[PDB]
Every structure is written in C-alpha cells, then in structure tokens.
C-alpha cells in the first residue's frame, strides 16, 4: 500500500509583485524533494538518501517544471484576486494537493487533485477523474471552463500514467515500515484522580486510544497526535475517575503495527 503526493503553495506579498512558491514531494507520506522560490538559485533538492542516485537530468527537468508551476500559480493568484475582488497589496495563499494511491499490487487505487484558496476548498477532481466539485461560485466558473476544455483528461492521464510509473521507480529505489506503540497509564490526583493513557514511539501516526466495561463516550481527554521528532509519534488519552475505582475502566490502543490491540491499565 503506497502513495505519491506533491503539496504546493504560492503566497502573495505586499509590493513584491511575485509570490513565494514552495513545492514539496512525498513518497509514502515521507518528504523526498522540495522547491522553494526564496532560495538564491531555486532548485529541487533531494530530501532523502535514495534520491541522490537520480542524475543531473532529473533535477534539471523537475526544476524547470517547478518554475512552470510557479508561473501558473502567479497567474492563478492574480486571477483569483479579480474573481473575489480582493484589494491589491494583501497577502493571499493558493495551494494544491496532487498525486496517487497504489494498492498492494502496485495498481492505482485512487488519483487526487485539489485546489484551495485562502486555505479554503476551491475545486477538486472527483475520484472518477472525469468530473469536478466546486466549493463556491468562483470555483464553479472555474469548473465550467475546465469541463468545457476537458482538463480532466490531462490530469487523468497524469494520475493513471506518469504518477504510477514514477512512483514505481521511486519505490524500487527505496519493503515495509511500522513501529508499535509502547504504552502505559499514569495516575494524577485531580481533587478525584486523572488516568492518562500513553502511547509512545509509534509509526505511522494513525492510532486509536479509548477507555472503557462499556465504550467510554466522553469526558475523554486527548491530544492531537504529535511527533517525537525521531521519526516516531506520541498521543495520550485521559479520563478523570474518582479514587479507588481505578481498576474499573480500560485503556485500549489500536495500531496497525501491533500484533493485536493493547489492553492496558493499573
């Protein structure tokens, strides 16, 4: 089960008629190339060891395409400005997500193309890779133009063609990952006593903790999953119980790197 994605951002500046264009490329949610128009001589750079085998021509070509896209974001920010009647000299962001998901056979599961403006959903390609979904009126004018010009056939050819092929090259140049949550519950006298279920050092980031012996609805205390910074992640989920009847609730952790869900307490 694999994936490739490019995440793109252009950000408009006051006075400087040219925006800052940053472009990151991921394989299996891991960074491997990055472009930042604010570098002195802007170029794609490897972000991982296995990219450094790709030779000079790769970097030349992809850098040229980065520059093409940059120009495209310039034009589209500029137009968006008019679509929404935004004042001159503001700051505005245009973003794009694109790429493809492969099944475990290395076949295409799904192709993805989305655009957002000012951090809001603007327009997106449906999973059929033929039609579009527009968020507001501006975006429908977009939608309308694109479906009249058949741009979807272009993006569909990319997602079914080069995105899969090149992902295959990349995978070959890279056959599986996971780390399991080491876990434990801590005790914290409220005024009553809090029980914090801890999950540490796991990868990937997706995980479910819950308390229980019926599924413990809420008064759930949880944090968004967070990176230890070593490549692993952390998360906890607490519940406030009064004294002594700790030994009545249960923490369970669900992670794909576990032989089986952990069932924890004390």
């Amino acid at each position: 089960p694999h994936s490739m994605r490019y995440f793109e951002t252009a950000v408009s500046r006051p006075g400087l008629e040219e925006p800052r264009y940053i472009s990151v490329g991921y394989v299996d949610n891991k960074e491997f190339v990055r472009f930042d128009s604010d570098a002195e001589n802007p170029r794609y750079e490897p972000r991982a060891p296995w990219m450094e085998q790709e030779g000079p021509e790769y970097w030349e070509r992809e850098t040229q395409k980065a520059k093409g896209q940059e120009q495209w974001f310039r034009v589209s920010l500029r137009n968006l400005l008019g679509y929404y009647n935004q004042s001159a000299g503001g700051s505005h962001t245009l973003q794009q997500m694109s790429g493809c998901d492969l099944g475990s056979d290395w076949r295409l599961l799904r192709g993805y193309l989305q655009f957002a403006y000012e951090g809001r959903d603007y327009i997106a390609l449906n999973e059929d890779l033929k039609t579009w979904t527009a968020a507001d009126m501006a975006a429908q004018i977009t939608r309308r133009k694109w479906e009249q010009s058949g741009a979807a056939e272009h993006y569909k050819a990319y997602l079914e063609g080069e995105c899969v092929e090149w992902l295959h090259r990349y995978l070959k140049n890279g056959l599986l990952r996971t780390d399991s949550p080491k876990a434990h519950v801590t005790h914290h006298p409220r005024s009553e006593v809090t029980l914090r279920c801890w999950a540490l050092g796991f990868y990937p980031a997706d995980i479910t903790l819950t308390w229980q012996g019926e599924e413990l609805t809420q008064d759930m205390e949880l944090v968004e999953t967070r990176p230890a910074g070593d490549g692993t992640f952390q998360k906890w989920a607490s519940v406030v119980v009064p004294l002594g009847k700790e030994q009545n609730y249960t923490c369970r952790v669900y992670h794909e790197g576990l032989p089986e869900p952990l069932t924890l307490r004390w």
Binding site: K65, Q69, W72, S76, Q96, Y117, S149, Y155, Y158, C163
Partner: peptide, 9 residues
C-alpha cells in the same frame, strides 16, 4: 515526478 497544470484557475 511533478504534475504540470493545464488551465489556470
């Protein structure tokens, strides 16, 4: 291998 856009927004 980056996508190259077609029609602008």
């Amino acid at each position: 291998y980056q996508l190259e856009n077609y029609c602008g927004l």
